[PDB]
Design a protein around this ligand. Sequence first.
Ligand SMILES: Cc1cc2nc3c(=O)[nH]c(=O)nc-3n(C[C@H](O)[C@H](O)[C@H](O)COP(=O)(O)OP(=O)(O)OC[C@H]3O[C@@H](n4cnc5c(N)ncnc54)[C@H](O)[C@@H]3O)c2cc1C
Ligand SMILES: Cc1cc2nc3c(=O)[nH]c(=O)nc-3n(C[C@H](O)[C@H](O)[C@H](O)COP(=O)(O)OP(=O)(O)OC[C@H]3O[C@@H](n4cnc5c(N)ncnc54)[C@H](O)[C@@H]3O)c2cc1C
Ligand SMILES: Cc1cc2nc3c(=O)[nH]c(=O)nc-3n(C[C@H](O)[C@H](O)[C@H](O)COP(=O)(O)OP(=O)(O)OC[C@H]3O[C@@H](n4cnc5c(N)ncnc54)[C@H](O)[C@@H]3O)c2cc1C
Ligand SMILES: Cc1cc2nc3c(=O)[nH]c(=O)nc-3n(C[C@H](O)[C@H](O)[C@H](O)COP(=O)(O)OP(=O)(O)OC[C@H]3O[C@@H](n4cnc5c(N)ncnc54)[C@H](O)[C@@H]3O)c2cc1C
Ligand SMILES: CC(C)(COP(=O)(O)OP(=O)(O)OC[C@H]1O[C@@H](n2cnc3c(N)ncnc32)[C@H](O)[C@@H]1OP(=O)(O)O)[C@@H](O)C(=O)NCCC(=O)NCCSS
Ligand SMILES: CC(C)(COP(=O)(O)OP(=O)(O)OC[C@H]1O[C@@H](n2cnc3c(N)ncnc32)[C@H](O)[C@@H]1OP(=O)(O)O)[C@@H](O)C(=O)NCCC(=O)NCCSS
Ligand SMILES: CC(C)(COP(=O)(O)OP(=O)(O)OC[C@H]1O[C@@H](n2cnc3c(N)ncnc32)[C@H](O)[C@@H]1OP(=O)(O)O)[C@@H](O)C(=O)NCCC(=O)NCCSS
Ligand SMILES: CC(C)(COP(=O)(O)OP(=O)(O)OC[C@H]1O[C@@H](n2cnc3c(N)ncnc32)[C@H](O)[C@@H]1OP(=O)(O)O)[C@@H](O)C(=O)NCCC(=O)NCCSS
Ligand SMILES: [Cl-]
Ligand SMILES: [Cl-]
Ligand SMILES: [Cl-]
Ligand SMILES: [Cl-]
Ligand SMILES: [Cl-]
Ligand SMILES: [Cl-]
Ligand SMILES: [Cl-]
Ligand SMILES: [Cl-]
Ligand SMILES: [Cl-]
Ligand SMILES: [Cl-]
Lengths: 377, 381, 377, 381
Amino acid sequence: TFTDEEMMIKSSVKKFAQEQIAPLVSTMDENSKMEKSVIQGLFQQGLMGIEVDPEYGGTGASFLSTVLVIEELAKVDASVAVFCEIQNTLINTLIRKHGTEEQKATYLPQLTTEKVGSFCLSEAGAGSDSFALKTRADKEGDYYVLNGSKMWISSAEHAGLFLVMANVDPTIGYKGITSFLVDRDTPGLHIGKPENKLGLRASSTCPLTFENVKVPEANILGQIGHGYKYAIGSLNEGRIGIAAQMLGLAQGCFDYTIPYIKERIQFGKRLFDFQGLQHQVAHVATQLEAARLLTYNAARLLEAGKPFIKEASMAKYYASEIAGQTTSKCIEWMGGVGYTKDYPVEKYFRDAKIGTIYEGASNIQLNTIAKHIDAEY
Amino acid sequence: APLQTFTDEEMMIKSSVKKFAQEQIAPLVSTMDENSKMEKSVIQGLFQQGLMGIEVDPEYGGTGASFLSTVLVIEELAKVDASVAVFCEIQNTLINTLIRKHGTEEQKATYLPQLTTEKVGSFCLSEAGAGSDSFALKTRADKEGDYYVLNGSKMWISSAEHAGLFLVMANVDPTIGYKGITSFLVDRDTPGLHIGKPENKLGLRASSTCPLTFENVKVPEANILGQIGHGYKYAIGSLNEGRIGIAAQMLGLAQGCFDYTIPYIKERIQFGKRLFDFQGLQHQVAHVATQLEAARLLTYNAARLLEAGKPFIKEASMAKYYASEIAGQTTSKCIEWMGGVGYTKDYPVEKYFRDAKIGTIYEGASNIQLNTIAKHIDAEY
Amino acid sequence: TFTDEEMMIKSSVKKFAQEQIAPLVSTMDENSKMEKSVIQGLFQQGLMGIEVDPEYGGTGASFLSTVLVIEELAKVDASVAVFCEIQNTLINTLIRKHGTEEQKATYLPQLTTEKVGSFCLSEAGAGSDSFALKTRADKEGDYYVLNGSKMWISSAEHAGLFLVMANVDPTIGYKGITSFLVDRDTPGLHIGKPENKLGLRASSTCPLTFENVKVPEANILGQIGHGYKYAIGSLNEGRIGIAAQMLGLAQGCFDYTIPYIKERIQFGKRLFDFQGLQHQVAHVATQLEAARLLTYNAARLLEAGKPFIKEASMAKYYASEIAGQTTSKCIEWMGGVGYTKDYPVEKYFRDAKIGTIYEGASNIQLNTIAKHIDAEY
Amino acid sequence: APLQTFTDEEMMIKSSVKKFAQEQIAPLVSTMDENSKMEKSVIQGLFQQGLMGIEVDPEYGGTGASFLSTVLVIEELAKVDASVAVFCEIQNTLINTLIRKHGTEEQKATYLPQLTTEKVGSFCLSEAGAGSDSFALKTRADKEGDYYVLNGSKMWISSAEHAGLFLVMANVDPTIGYKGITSFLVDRDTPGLHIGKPENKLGLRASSTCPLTFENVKVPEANILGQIGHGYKYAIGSLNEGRIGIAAQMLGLAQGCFDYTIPYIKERIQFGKRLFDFQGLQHQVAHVATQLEAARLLTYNAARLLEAGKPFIKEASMAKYYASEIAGQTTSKCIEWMGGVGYTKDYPVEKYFRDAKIGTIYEGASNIQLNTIAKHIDAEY
Ligand SMILES: Cc1cc2nc3c(=O)[nH]c(=O)nc-3n(C[C@H](O)[C@H](O)[C@H](O)COP(=O)(O)OP(=O)(O)OC[C@H]3O[C@@H](n4cnc5c(N)ncnc54)[C@H](O)[C@@H]3O)c2cc1C
Ligand SMILES: Cc1cc2nc3c(=O)[nH]c(=O)nc-3n(C[C@H](O)[C@H](O)[C@H](O)COP(=O)(O)OP(=O)(O)OC[C@H]3O[C@@H](n4cnc5c(N)ncnc54)[C@H](O)[C@@H]3O)c2cc1C
Ligand SMILES: Cc1cc2nc3c(=O)[nH]c(=O)nc-3n(C[C@H](O)[C@H](O)[C@H](O)COP(=O)(O)OP(=O)(O)OC[C@H]3O[C@@H](n4cnc5c(N)ncnc54)[C@H](O)[C@@H]3O)c2cc1C
Ligand SMILES: Cc1cc2nc3c(=O)[nH]c(=O)nc-3n(C[C@H](O)[C@H](O)[C@H](O)COP(=O)(O)OP(=O)(O)OC[C@H]3O[C@@H](n4cnc5c(N)ncnc54)[C@H](O)[C@@H]3O)c2cc1C
Ligand SMILES: CC(C)(COP(=O)(O)OP(=O)(O)OC[C@H]1O[C@@H](n2cnc3c(N)ncnc32)[C@H](O)[C@@H]1OP(=O)(O)O)[C@@H](O)C(=O)NCCC(=O)NCCSS
Ligand SMILES: CC(C)(COP(=O)(O)OP(=O)(O)OC[C@H]1O[C@@H](n2cnc3c(N)ncnc32)[C@H](O)[C@@H]1OP(=O)(O)O)[C@@H](O)C(=O)NCCC(=O)NCCSS
Ligand SMILES: CC(C)(COP(=O)(O)OP(=O)(O)OC[C@H]1O[C@@H](n2cnc3c(N)ncnc32)[C@H](O)[C@@H]1OP(=O)(O)O)[C@@H](O)C(=O)NCCC(=O)NCCSS
Ligand SMILES: CC(C)(COP(=O)(O)OP(=O)(O)OC[C@H]1O[C@@H](n2cnc3c(N)ncnc32)[C@H](O)[C@@H]1OP(=O)(O)O)[C@@H](O)C(=O)NCCC(=O)NCCSS
Ligand SMILES: [Cl-]
Ligand SMILES: [Cl-]
Ligand SMILES: [Cl-]
Ligand SMILES: [Cl-]
Ligand SMILES: [Cl-]
Ligand SMILES: [Cl-]
Ligand SMILES: [Cl-]
Ligand SMILES: [Cl-]
Ligand SMILES: [Cl-]
Ligand SMILES: [Cl-]
């Protein structure tokens, strides 16, 4: 039961996705390249500043709107959904919450209209162990020198803004981790070739290297040493976003597959009429239902200002795990055609597999959930 | 708002039941299980606390609360004793609802004040040859003057040992199949009605479960509940609601089991660590917690859909299937997390395990839930 | 494919179980009491000395014969099976392997004819962490004083011999653990009342208290400080025994249930003809087949003198887990009648649940398998 | 003796294929996957190593080895590349077996020497309207003098791009249903036979999978393989063995993936620990190891049952179902254990994952395997 605005935004995104994205899904996947038409369409439609204030060109909508947009996009293409998720839930939120009036006035208008941001936390030696990051920041008078590397950076290929976590004092561990706003065009910053991936292929995923990258002191986001707090704070909200992506992906796969099994006839009946298959369908539908409830409930808790971290982890864990199961089963229900790239279900399957890995792997979600359970008893 | 946000009345009712269960039920749980016998004090308490007429209008002695209140009461009772919870669920969700929905004004005035104050009802559908296939029931009702004569048998009748009222589904015209099935309000002490000995069961042992036989049982024509030949409709309609009620029971028992077990694994030490600090065990606990959360949301959402007058049958089936399946998994894992002590009757987790197993069988076995969900999915595409 | 002797032993055990045990299963379960007639029959049939040399009244059979016997008994009553498994795989084996010729001459003739043995490792503070056992043994000239308590001792109510693990020097930790042959009627040895259990109810499970229990130095089994090794060695073999018990229990439950679902009619069909149910049955059958192959292969690896520990753990883990799944499903396939004590499937379900707990709980089995996988690469 | 105790010849053949696969196949696996194109060198190499006539008698240029040897060759190949394994599986367990078991002495003398040395065969059963329902195939064979004229189409034909021989199931009398189905030996260069474009696939990409069409394809009556109208029996007979072959492929690919992943999780450090030392991950690994072990035993036992002339169809279905299902779970878990690198094509685990998914679909989808298993269980009680 959504507000009028939430319902309108959902219907608008559904139309946009069907008309502007669906025709391109296959070719974007094949060539690991999101089309400019889609990217600029997202900005044009106000989908890159959903919660940002209108004064900065934002839509001014609710967090649940962002969730419904992510879900609705992912029903067509999970790659476009995460592209939208990163901008809204990681980049925009961090700048909204911790930016100075100066930083907000500068960056938010660009971020709602044409500039793409990348969230730069992970390194080769700091994946699940994010706070072991070795990218360092040395204060030299009016600027900081950044040295290190990042790995797996989503949207980096054409990003203009990099939100970079770097340690200003490695002798104090994670409490030296600080957030920096870094412009693309700066000596020493290199964005490498996008990875060649199993799925999520249209979402660029690039290595970064920082060779004596110089960042003005005014480009520190928030307080020195609090960057670890901002990283995991934004990722707590990001887990709801990834729950929504995984949900939408799984739903889109399911929605496509049921009409097929209704129409396909073997042994004189609809595939849907074999009870073994009906039971698998019903089991999966129940899991999709549970996933949707967990995702929306986490979102509503966040909106209400209630504790939501355990619930966000629960949604991301469950939705990502059941998206793997849903997509795997849909290929089977389709049979042979499901194994071919002429049908969409094999892409949903390839895309879903990422969900149990990024924004905190499944084991990490369970660790977080257990910590919360320990504190409740 | 979040699914766990309740009205003031819902919150107050939940709180009262928690207190009542802990004070009046918990000390008797073990004895009742051991002896397969519900205590009169507990039955009296349920009535005295208003828990047998939760949604019934205050004009008939009821509390006039929401359906979600009934769900919360069942859950809360089941955290302490699943057998007491089903006793409450049958009265509210099957018996009272059938009469509230399909009774004449005279029938409501006559039966509801008794059902809210002292009289227990039994729902009588199933037979030896008609379990999942309920509408193959062979109990027949033959019209003689202004009465019907009932002949046949029923099986698996819960609360029969104490019930004053039996809501009996019987066929008035077996040649038209299910469309002959009719609901009858049969009083306990009607000549020809025999209540057999209670089953010796794995769990839910304090809830009496008895066979019935009908030998020329005379029932006035006025004692038909609703329209002749619509008994099948009324039975399954009430069971659609009862499925949310069984979801609530399964949820509550799984939660009670889990809540008991976590403090133990935090306290118990092996290899110098709390059991809770073994990551394998932690992951299992977190996975189970997630399933409990999903089961809760499914159950409450089904209840809210029902309250909003929205379609709820698929969702009720989803809640019952899911809650019952994860109640089995939850209780099975809790025994393991407890270790050896979990396998003994000196601890409560083995009873929760035995009790949970019924949830995938009664009020429509799991396969039947899946068949129902599939029918709705086919209609949606 | 088995040897002529293995086939003959299996066939005679099947007969003995159906004629002498089956009629008593319900009552033994209801009363939590093993019948003396059943115990006498086990000894009389040569089932309590399966691999013991004929010198000592044994049957002189193979280890796989012991596995087949435990499986066949468990098809009728898991409680009777474990009684047999403890005697053969834990007690007899330890005395055969580590006994002096005088100890063998004394105890093995008794253990094959009338005397029941109990294996005494676990304590309240030492279950999974067995080697944290606090029962101590002090040498006082020609004897050892044992002080402490044990928990969960199977067969204790009837046992004339207790094989006890006690620590002779706790500063050395587990390397002080030593094994002692203790006669029932020794002062200071108190056997508590049997546990009131969920299942395996006919197998007595008692606490023991050792208040200054004096064991002659002649009654040390093996070398001092090597008791930890004997304990876990016998338990490696015991794990194959419990796999066989769990296999038999699950197979007996399955074998009972299939005729019912073929005979029972709903909606004008045999229950067996509903495809959802068929698929569940076929899935369980596949797991039963896999559990059997794991159990027998582990047994053959032991007999061939090949490494078998990883394989024994895999068998016990898998067979116990699928015994729980099989019995849970069988109740569902039977419907209402499966939930009543008038039918046998609810007992199989209560009995199966102990399989993932005793003889090293599932998590411990997985830790062991992981240690071996670690060593293979 | 344990199921992993082989004959000296079986051990020798396993070792030989391991060496061949590592030296001749491993370097090319990524290119073949990327290009969807099997390399000529690999196919030539399979023939040269004697891997395309494993069980064929030496009088026809075969090795005359055991069926378990074929299983071990398939397993060992799939550890490196499941596409190459299926290429070998079809030739040995479908094509060579059909002709060995049901060919005349003349057909054996003509075809087996070709098939053991240079000629690839395709097995042509499935159609767009006849997948799981194979025997609903509509390809017709009409008698015209001493010849049969084939008309229709096939779908999903593996190895078609390279095949010189097509074993085609066609119905000579559609009015008698499945009893009209007949196997035909059809040369690639027969007029009227057209091989369509290879499918663009999720995995198994180096194995060509093509549609066929038959326009008045004239076959001499001597080219019927076996008895007219028994082609349904021959086809499903060969598929019962092929199910053990696919079990072996799924087993080998899962094992290869597993074997690659364990050293990685031993060496990768996070939070100061090897990934292998996180107990949650350890338990997942141990669980997967147990499943692999169980799949191996099911696979080898089914093979040994077949060799002993014992009933093996239920066991073959159990092996294929179980191995395919756990290959999916194994490869899915390996990607997770690897983390980010597992999701990239620079590492080999994502290909195992994509390849494994075909296992639950071809050679009789999982549901069909369960149906077959159930039919045998019914006969046993
Ligand atoms: C396509 C893609 C896009 C991404 N997007 C971004 C991005 O935009 N910005 C960014 O900063 N990062 C991004 N990530 C990085 C992502 O968050 C990491 O891949 C993830 O955190 C896991 O790190 P890892 O790959 O180093 O795996 P590892 O940390 O090496 O984990 C491997 C396995 O070890 C297990 N494991 C690790 N630690 C524990 C533990 N303590 N307990 C139990 N199990 C454990 C994990 O659960 C996992 O199963 C992206 C990654 C990918 C693949
Ligand atoms: C303790 C207890 C209390 C009960 N309470 C009551 C009560 O108060 N009043 C009352 O009327 N009944 C009551 N029931 C009856 C209960 O609802 C039935 O046991 C249940 O509906 C199953 O019927 P059955 O036992 O005959 O099993 P069956 O119908 O024989 O089912 C056996 C198995 O077959 C499967 N199956 C059956 N049909 C299909 C199908 N079409 N497709 C796929 N699978 C199928 C089922 O899912 C199940 O797994 C109670 C039962 C018990 C055990
Ligand atoms: C009926 C019965 C009969 C028995 N028979 C005998 C007998 O004859 N003789 C005898 O000596 N003993 C016997 N046992 C004892 C049995 O072996 C123990 O109950 C078992 O080893 C577990 O010990 P615990 O009960 O203290 O549970 P705990 O050790 O407290 O374990 C509880 C849970 O914690 C988990 N856990 C513990 N350690 C770890 C770890 N390192 N990593 C991950 N998870 C962990 C366990 O897997 C389990 O899930 C019997 C027990 C029973 C119930
Ligand atoms: C890469 C590839 C290679 C192949 N190789 C060959 C080859 O060389 N030669 C050849 O002839 N064929 C080959 N096959 C065809 C393959 O065997 C079929 O795809 C398979 O039998 C499934 O048929 P289908 O694709 O039409 O799916 P369908 O028959 O439409 O099945 C779709 C789904 O419906 C379910 N279903 C169908 N019937 C039932 C039932 N009765 N009960 C319960 N569930 C049911 C299935 O289990 C599956 O989940 C190949 C296929 C592929 C994709
Ligand atoms: C967050 C992280 C890195 C912390 O692990 P670890 O180093 O073991 O953390 P801890 O020792 O428990 O705590 C360190 C600090 O983090 C905080 N913290 C840890 N998890 C948190 C969470 N989920 N939410 C908020 N704070 C958290 C702790 O409160 C502590 O801060 P303070 O000293 O100010 O109280 C880990 O749990 C995690 O989530 N890793 C995956 C990160 C991720 O999602 N990456 C994906 C990037 S986009 S694909
Ligand atoms: C309800 C029942 C018996 C019907 O099975 P079946 O005979 O296959 O039903 P159908 O042939 O699909 O339809 C029969 C009638 O019931 C209706 N119906 C079936 N399921 C229904 C449901 N869940 N809700 C409402 N109506 C339902 C049908 O619409 C039809 O009525 P109409 O002719 O008025 O449209 C079966 O689905 C079921 O739920 N069985 C278990 C019953 C149960 O829960 N027993 C427990 C008692 S307490 S333990
Ligand atoms: C065996 C036990 C107690 C060891 O605990 P743990 O902390 O892992 O011990 P470790 O540090 O691994 O090693 C201690 C010694 O035991 C040995 N050991 C451990 N597990 C072993 C096994 N499965 N087989 C053989 N030896 C084993 C080690 O080799 C070491 O001996 P050495 O010092 O001579 O090399 C534990 O893994 C276990 O299995 N617990 C359950 C015990 C059980 O089955 N109880 C049931 C009784 S009847 S229900
Ligand atoms: C075999 C097949 C096609 C037919 O199923 P179905 O319609 O239920 O067949 P049935 O009615 O049970 O029996 C039809 C005939 O086939 C026989 N048969 C069926 N399954 C058999 C099996 N597994 N082994 C041997 N014979 C079998 C029957 O005995 C009967 O022949 P007879 O009249 O001589 O006794 C189906 O079960 C199957 O296996 N489908 C998948 C086919 C496959 O593997 N395709 C892959 C090609 S390569 S990817
Ligand atoms: Cl803003
Ligand atoms: Cl991108
Ligand atoms: Cl009312
Ligand atoms: Cl009662
Ligand atoms: Cl789930
Ligand atoms: Cl001996
Ligand atoms: Cl005993
Ligand atoms: Cl399994
Ligand atoms: Cl030959
Ligand atoms: Cl090819």
